[PDB]
Design a protein around this ligand. Structure first.
Ligand SMILES: [K+]
Ligand SMILES: [K+]
Ligand SMILES: [K+]
Ligand SMILES: [K+]
Ligand SMILES: [K+]
Ligand SMILES: [K+]
Ligand SMILES: [K+]
Ligand SMILES: [K+]
Ligand SMILES: [K+]
Ligand SMILES: [K+]
Ligand SMILES: [K+]
Ligand SMILES: [K+]
Ligand SMILES: [K+]
Ligand SMILES: [K+]
Ligand SMILES: [K+]
Ligand SMILES: [K+]
Ligand SMILES: [K+]
Ligand SMILES: [K+]
Ligand SMILES: [K+]
Ligand SMILES: [K+]
Ligand SMILES: [K+]
Ligand SMILES: [K+]
Ligand SMILES: [Mg+2]
Ligand SMILES: [Mg+2]
Ligand SMILES: [Mg+2]
Ligand SMILES: [Mg+2]
Ligand SMILES: [Mg+2]
Ligand SMILES: [Mg+2]
Ligand SMILES: [Mg+2]
Ligand SMILES: [Mg+2]
Ligand SMILES: [Mg+2]
Ligand SMILES: [Mg+2]
Ligand SMILES: [Mg+2]
Ligand SMILES: [Mg+2]
Ligand SMILES: [Mg+2]
Ligand SMILES: [Mg+2]
Ligand SMILES: [Mg+2]
Ligand SMILES: [Mg+2]
Ligand SMILES: [Mg+2]
Ligand SMILES: [Mg+2]
Ligand SMILES: [Mg+2]
Ligand SMILES: [Mg+2]
Ligand SMILES: [Mg+2]
Ligand SMILES: [Mg+2]
Ligand SMILES: [Mg+2]
Ligand SMILES: [Mg+2]
Ligand SMILES: [Mg+2]
Ligand SMILES: [Mg+2]
Ligand SMILES: [Mg+2]
Ligand SMILES: [Mg+2]
Ligand SMILES: [Mg+2]
Ligand SMILES: [Mg+2]
Ligand SMILES: [Mg+2]
Ligand SMILES: [Mg+2]
Ligand SMILES: [Mg+2]
Ligand SMILES: [Mg+2]
Ligand SMILES: [Mg+2]
Ligand SMILES: [Mg+2]
Ligand SMILES: [Mg+2]
Ligand SMILES: [Mg+2]
Ligand SMILES: [Mg+2]
Ligand SMILES: [Mg+2]
Ligand SMILES: [Mg+2]
Ligand SMILES: [Mg+2]
Ligand SMILES: [Mg+2]
Ligand SMILES: [Mg+2]
Ligand SMILES: [Mg+2]
Ligand SMILES: [Mg+2]
Ligand SMILES: [Mg+2]
Ligand SMILES: [Mg+2]
Ligand SMILES: [Mg+2]
Ligand SMILES: [Mg+2]
Ligand SMILES: [Mg+2]
Ligand SMILES: [Mg+2]
Ligand SMILES: [Mg+2]
Ligand SMILES: [Mg+2]
Ligand SMILES: [Mg+2]
Ligand SMILES: [Mg+2]
Ligand SMILES: [Mg+2]
Ligand SMILES: [Mg+2]
Ligand SMILES: [Mg+2]
Ligand SMILES: [Mg+2]
Ligand SMILES: [Mg+2]
Ligand SMILES: [Mg+2]
Ligand SMILES: [Mg+2]
Ligand SMILES: [Mg+2]
Ligand SMILES: [Mg+2]
Ligand SMILES: [Mg+2]
Ligand SMILES: [Mg+2]
Ligand SMILES: [Mg+2]
Ligand SMILES: [Mg+2]
Ligand SMILES: [Mg+2]
Ligand SMILES: [Mg+2]
Ligand SMILES: [Mg+2]
Ligand SMILES: [Mg+2]
Ligand SMILES: [Mg+2]
Ligand SMILES: [Mg+2]
Ligand SMILES: [Zn+2]
Lengths: 123, 198, 207, 114, 118
RNA sequence: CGGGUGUGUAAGCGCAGCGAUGCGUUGAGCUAACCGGUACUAAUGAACCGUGAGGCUUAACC
RNA sequence: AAGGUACUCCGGGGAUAACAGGCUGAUACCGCCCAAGAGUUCAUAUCGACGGCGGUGUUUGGCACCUCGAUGUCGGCUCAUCACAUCCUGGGGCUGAAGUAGGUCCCAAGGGUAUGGCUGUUCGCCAUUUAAAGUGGUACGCGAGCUGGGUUUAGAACGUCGUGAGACAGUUCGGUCCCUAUCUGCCGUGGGCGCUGGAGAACUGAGGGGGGCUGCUCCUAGUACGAGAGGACCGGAGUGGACGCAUCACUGGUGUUCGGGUUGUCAUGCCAAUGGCACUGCCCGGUAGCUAAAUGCGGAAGAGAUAAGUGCUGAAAGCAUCUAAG
RNA sequence: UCGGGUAAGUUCCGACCUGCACGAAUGGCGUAAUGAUGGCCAGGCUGUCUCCACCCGAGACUCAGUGAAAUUGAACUCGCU
RNA sequence: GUGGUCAGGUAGAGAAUACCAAGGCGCUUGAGAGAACUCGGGUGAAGGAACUAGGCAAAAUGGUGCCGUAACUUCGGGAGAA
RNA sequence: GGAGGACCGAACCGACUAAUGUUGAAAAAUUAGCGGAUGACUUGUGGCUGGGGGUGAAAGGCCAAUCAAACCGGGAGAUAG
């Protein structure tokens, strides 16, 4: 449940540490983005000599949320923090070469199949 | 980013290249033109983006199409920086003597392709031209424009066009339509020289 | 045609695939035809049915006679269903939940839960005004209800505070999860109007 | 009530093990990738148990790949293949929400020995 | 809305309600009949009768629970010594309410509530 | 009354410890609005209101 | 015999200004007529010089008819409702329409029609969205609904003008927003009587209201089209955004009426155990109910009569002609 | 205007000098400390907001007692054009 | 609104505050109900100033001891910096 | 050793913000916060200054709910195109 102004941790090695959602893409007046939803972000914090730099505006996919995801049985998977993977604006493919932390099966799609492969654990 | 006159130059060279493709029957000459045209566009932009390169590639293709040309023109148009219309109060400062001076609304595209903005009162047969100088200070000139229209080489664009004599008693014929004039103009200096000539 | 049932409550059905389906349990006891309406007499084709039981003392003499003519025992209420040209029924016939055995989707009609007098925020999803920033006694108030001298009135159908719920509502195109003739149970996917123990009219989906 | 109870009872698992809050349990969950179906294991402390018949649920908290993860399971759901108590923990409370704010040495639970 | 809710606020806060019923329950045990407002009598049943049910089994814990609820050793004694034994056979309905007109001062509906054995 | 649910092993007693406290009895005690039951209490015999076959004309039918 | 007054005051005026209304329509805005030209050629795909004729009430104005024994004035908020000169979605003609994507005109008002940064702003610019981010009317809709940042009292200061008091279509900081609804209206909800003996039910449907949005992906098909590049119509399927209705099975919130922990103090003779009070003293959990962030469902298909438009047959008018008959 | 800060800054800060119309006791320029002083930014914090939900109390509502007010030419006091 | 005097206990730096003593009171309409809405409070998923003219209001911080503490400074400060 | 228009903070003296209240509980308050709190401090009692006069750390403030000229009585039935 990510909205504009929400701060997310980064689950990749792009070099961004903290990012802020500036837009939830995909609809008019769309309030929230869940896991698997692409968002527009600005890099608030970045590591030195990273691929990405502070103040850069790019896209990202939400991979973990505190609110969590609901499974067909009614089961819930929640995480301690909200996390995203930085994507190239045009390609919408992961900028980073590594994925850190567990990801949900909701990202099991052709678009985000690379992330699933890189991810250590898929829940 | 490119100036309006620069865009007009690019537009002209592209049209020439298309004309060359149609008319020229010698491949080698075409190659020279292709290179010439390519170089000119390369001269315009210090750094060329891949979209420019793609556009160039289409331009390079001997079988160019007018639709293709238009698309290429549109891509180049994006780079062009529009002429900024002055604020009402700024305009008034420019023309203090003129009272209740007004500018007719100009299309955004027109502003993009306009080196200078010129409008006619018509009722008083007055043409008002506003242009930013090299210092980037807006400069306004207002002068009588003839009601009669004749075809002749226009001083501002140095092209044969429908022209009316303008007096700000030697006079210079200028295009009745400033927007048409702006399209024709490919060099800002020419306009500056015209002002100097006045 | 449709049957009258009662809302037993809600539960889940776990599928083998592991999907959990929200289901509303509707008890459809046999519906007994009390009267048949025809074009000649009534000007329309329909069947009137009853279900359940009523205390003999509670049944009035006029009600009892209507049940007696049918030959059916007294039911809690009387409901009518319009008949299609093909359909034909006889007085005293009992219709069971097996009717919906082959019905994929149904429309369920019931009386909604009564909320009493409700404000515009709850009733029409009006936005509340500022909680702070100087707001004087106007946090949940409706705001303007019109214009000025033109038109000089409030238009009919203006959304305002008033009674909410306790009204007939239909939810259409609910999937039929299970039909149990033995237990007289219809299991339908999703929520249906009304509180537990309320009368539900179930019909095959019109759409 | 009785009608729904009969329906609920028919679907209820009879193999559910006894577990308490603070117990470390491993839950085997069925996971389907394409055609293939495999059992994935989730092991962590039980922090909450909701006793509600067929609607019973339990919440398991683990730290995975440096990230805290909590999973609410529907006990009688077919997705849960099996539950096993790896360790029994000694706590005084029904709900262990305080463990969310604790990590490492702070988050340790004493074993219940009996 | 108050769907499926129980209890009467009686235009008091929770602390005042609890205290009043603890006093009123004592009064009913002491006198075995009291005159009160009809709504308060209906509420008093839900407080007094469980106390009598508790009194049926005599134990230190039960007496202490009764003391916690009543805070009167005399009432606890009478409950366990007298009322508990008296009502042992009876299952519920330890009290009866009798409507007795309206109060002069405020026209409040009034009722007597008494122990059934009295 | 039984159950469920929630909270989380009551009091008392015993044991261990200098003691705080722990342990056993004990998943104990307690448990609202829930669920299934149950006339123990309260829903009274009455009384009250509402009548006594329902205008005229014409047509058709019996 | 000169001035100031925002420190002000009284008698008057809608005889006379500022707001809104009215009349008007110069101006504004929208449309049309002629066609010099532009458009490689070619007035009319698109555009249109010099001139001409209208429409709207819609800007800036003109007038001073209403109101000066008071018609609260900008912007925002809340809530809207109408028009169509249509922003999107629907239908269609022409195209300088290969496809894709456009241009332009016609029909069409059912529904839908951003969030932020800056600024009191309306606006505008910018950032990032969207199918789109429509234009207008409604006292520049809406202060007996809210706000009070702008603006226009009294304080103070700067620049400026003035000898000065003071003043500024300059700026700066501070600066009381009342009303218990009688009537109309509107949202709900009852009582009376009527409906022709009385009574209990079930209905019919005159009439009224609600609802009507749309993205993306896949298939058809890399098929038609095209030198390639690219890339459909038509048709079908899935999955979303926004919105609405219902519901509480699930996930949660709340749960001063359930259980527990715990600080200070007082009391129950004391111990032990409990109770009162301290925001429920402070907290931790939590039943029912209520509820959204939770999870079901909806917009339709279909039919009839049509708009622009497209025709068939067909004279008047031996041809032609969608129209005059049909 | 340029630079800083923001994804985006008519405010803010640092510069520039083109001072409509600064300027030296109706003082000029600085200035530690101080300020219920003006502007701007950040962390924390949050129902301010996305977007409201539930709950506890006091009113509102119903019954008994008491019992105002402003206003009011008269009223048998609808819509639209 | 109104000057002076008196000053118990536990905790506490205290005449703060909390609970109590002596002493004094429950504030001269009540009784129900448990709608909207208003007032005064409690709690809140995910987010966290996106609100707004403006973080207005709210939330938050809060004690004692010890460690430690910047620019700048009129050498006192700043400083309870953090 | 014990200075200070010193610091924190009750009484006491003020009154920065918000809400409520606006036919009020009240003709200026209440509630939650807020400033000073050994001083140019605050407070009791008595006294003195008088209306073009007083008094004013200056707001045209205040001078008995009255102030760019108090109140009361009189000129007085001022005058009112
Ligand atoms: K024990
Ligand atoms: K024990
Ligand atoms: K238990
Ligand atoms: K004068
Ligand atoms: K026209
Ligand atoms: K042509
Ligand atoms: K006026
Ligand atoms: K078209
Ligand atoms: K429309
Ligand atoms: K409008
Ligand atoms: K107005
Ligand atoms: K306003
Ligand atoms: K009004
Ligand atoms: K109001
Ligand atoms: K009226
Ligand atoms: K629920
Ligand atoms: K709940
Ligand atoms: K205590
Ligand atoms: K001087
Ligand atoms: K000096
Ligand atoms: K300052
Ligand atoms: K005087
Ligand atoms: Mg209800
Ligand atoms: Mg709002
Ligand atoms: Mg107010
Ligand atoms: Mg309020
Ligand atoms: Mg009940
Ligand atoms: Mg009361
Ligand atoms: Mg209390
Ligand atoms: Mg029980
Ligand atoms: Mg249990
Ligand atoms: Mg205990
Ligand atoms: Mg044990
Ligand atoms: Mg029951
Ligand atoms: Mg002034
Ligand atoms: Mg003054
Ligand atoms: Mg006057
Ligand atoms: Mg007039
Ligand atoms: Mg006017
Ligand atoms: Mg008027
Ligand atoms: Mg013309
Ligand atoms: Mg006008
Ligand atoms: Mg006149
Ligand atoms: Mg008047
Ligand atoms: Mg139209
Ligand atoms: Mg409409
Ligand atoms: Mg229709
Ligand atoms: Mg904006
Ligand atoms: Mg207005
Ligand atoms: Mg408007
Ligand atoms: Mg008001
Ligand atoms: Mg109004
Ligand atoms: Mg203001
Ligand atoms: Mg000066
Ligand atoms: Mg209709
Ligand atoms: Mg309609
Ligand atoms: Mg929804
Ligand atoms: Mg439930
Ligand atoms: Mg919960
Ligand atoms: Mg709670
Ligand atoms: Mg004692
Ligand atoms: Mg003790
Ligand atoms: Mg006490
Ligand atoms: Mg006390
Ligand atoms: Mg249709
Ligand atoms: Mg013919
Ligand atoms: Mg900001
Ligand atoms: Mg800048
Ligand atoms: Mg700002
Ligand atoms: Mg600056
Ligand atoms: Mg001087
Ligand atoms: Mg000075
Ligand atoms: Mg200075
Ligand atoms: Mg009364
Ligand atoms: Mg009217
Ligand atoms: Mg005093
Ligand atoms: Mg003391
Ligand atoms: Mg005190
Ligand atoms: Mg209430
Ligand atoms: Mg409230
Ligand atoms: Mg709170
Ligand atoms: Mg929250
Ligand atoms: Mg939270
Ligand atoms: Mg934060
Ligand atoms: Mg903002
Ligand atoms: Mg905003
Ligand atoms: Mg504040
Ligand atoms: Mg606070
Ligand atoms: Mg001091
Ligand atoms: Mg003072
Ligand atoms: Mg105060
Ligand atoms: Mg100080
Ligand atoms: Mg102090
Ligand atoms: Mg005075
Ligand atoms: Mg005088
Ligand atoms: Mg005289
Ligand atoms: Mg006189
Ligand atoms: Zn020219």
């Amino acid at each position: 449940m990510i909205q504009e102004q929400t701060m997310l941790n980064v689950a990749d090695n792009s070099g961004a540490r903290r990012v802020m959602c500036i837009k939830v893409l995909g609809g008019s007046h769309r309030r929230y983005a869940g896991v698997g939803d692409i968002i527009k972000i600005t890099i608030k914090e970045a590591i030195p000599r990273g691929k990405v730099k502070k103040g850069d505006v790019l896209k990202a996919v939400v991979v973990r949320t505190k609110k969590g995801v609901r499974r067909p049985d009614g089961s819930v998977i929640r995480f301690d923090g909200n996390a995203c993977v930085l994507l190239n604006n045009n390609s919408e493919q992961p900028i980073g070469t590594r994925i850190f932390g567990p990801v949900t099966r909701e990202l099991r799609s052709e678009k985000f199949m690379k992330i699933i492969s890189l991810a250590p654990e898929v829940l | 980013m490119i100036y309006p006159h620069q865009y007009n130059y690019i537009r002209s060279v592209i049209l020439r290249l298309k004309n060359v493709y149609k008319t020229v029957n010698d491949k080698e000459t075409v190659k020279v033109i292709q290179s010439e045209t390519y170089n000119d566009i390369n001269e315009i932009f210090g750094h060329i983006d891949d979209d420019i390169e793609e556009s160039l590639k289409v331009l390079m293709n001997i079988r160019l199409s007018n639709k293709e040309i238009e698309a290429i023109l549109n891509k180049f148009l994006e780079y062009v920086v529009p002429f900024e219309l002055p604020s009402p109060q700024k305009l008034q400062k420019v023309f203090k003597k003129v009272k209740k001076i007004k500018i007719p609304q100009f299309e955004e595209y027109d502003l993009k392709v306009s080196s200078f903005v010129g409008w006619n009162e018509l009722a008083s047969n007055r043409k008002y031209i506003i242009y930013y100088d090299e210092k980037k200070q807006l400069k306004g000139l207002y002068g009588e424009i003839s009601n009669q229209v004749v075809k002749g080489f226009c001083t501002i664009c140095n092209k044969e066009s429908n022209v009316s004599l303008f007096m700000k008693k030697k006079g210079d014929y200028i295009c009745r339509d400033s927007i048409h004039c702006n399209k024709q103009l490919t060099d800002i200096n020419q306009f500056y020289n015209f002002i100097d000539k006045l | 045609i449709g049957l009258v049932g009662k809302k037993v409550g809600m539960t889940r059905i776990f599928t083998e695939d592991g999907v959990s389906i929200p289901v509303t349990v509707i008890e459809v006891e046999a519906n007994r035809v009390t009267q048949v309406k025809d074009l000649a007499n009534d000007g329309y084709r329909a069947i009137q049915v009853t279900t359940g039981a009523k205390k003999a003392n509670r049944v009035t003499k006029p009600e009892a006679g209507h049940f007696a003519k049918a030959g059916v025992e007294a039911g809690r209420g009387l409901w009518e269903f319009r008949l299609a040209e093909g359909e034909e029924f006889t007085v005293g016939q009992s219709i069971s939940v097996e009717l919906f055995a082959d019905v994929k989707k149904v429309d369920v009609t019931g009386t909604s839960k009564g909320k009493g007098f409700a404000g515009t925020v709850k009733r029409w999803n009006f936005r509340t005004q500022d909680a702070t920033h100087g707001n004087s006694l106007s946090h949940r108030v409706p705001g303007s209800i019109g214009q000025n001298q033109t038109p000089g009135k409030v238009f009919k159908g203006k959304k305002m505070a008033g009674q909410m719920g306790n009204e007939r509502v239909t939810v259409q195109s609910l999937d039929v999860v299970r039909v149990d003739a033995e237990r007289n149970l219809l299991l339908v996917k999703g929520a249906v109007p009304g509180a537990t123990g309320s009368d539900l009219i179930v019909k095959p989906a019109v759409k | 009530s009785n009608i729904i109870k009969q329906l609920e009872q028919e679907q209820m698992k009879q193999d559910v093990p006894s577990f308490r809050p603070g117990d470390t349990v491993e839950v085997k969950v069925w996971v389907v990738e394409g055609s293939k179906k495999r059992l994935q294991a989730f092991e962590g402390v039980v922090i909450a148990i909701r006793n509600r018949g067929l609607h019973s649920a339990f919440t398991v908290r683990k730290i995975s790949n440096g990230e805290g993860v909590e999973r609410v399971f529907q006990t009688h759901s077919p997705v849960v293949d099996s539950i096993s108590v790896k360790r029994r923990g000694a706590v005084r409370k029904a709900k262990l929400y305080y463990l969310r704010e604790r990590t490492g040495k702070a988050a340790r639970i004493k074993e219940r020995l009996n | 809305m108050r769907h499926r809710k129980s209890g009467r606020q009686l235009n008091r806060n929770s602390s005042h309600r609890q205290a009043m019923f603890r006093n009123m329950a004592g009064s009913l045990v002491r006198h075995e009949i009291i005159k009160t407002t009809l709504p308060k009598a209906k509420e008093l049943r839900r407080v007094v009768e469980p106390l009598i049910t508790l009194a049926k089994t005599d134990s230190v814990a039960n007496r202490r629970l009764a003391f916690a609820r009543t805070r009167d050793n005399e009432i606890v004694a009478k409950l366990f010594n007298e009322l508990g034994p008296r009502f042992a056979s009876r299952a519920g309905g330890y009290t009866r309410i009798l409507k007795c007109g309206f109060r002069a001062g405020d026209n409040a509906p009034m009722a007597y509530i008494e122990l059934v054995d009295r």
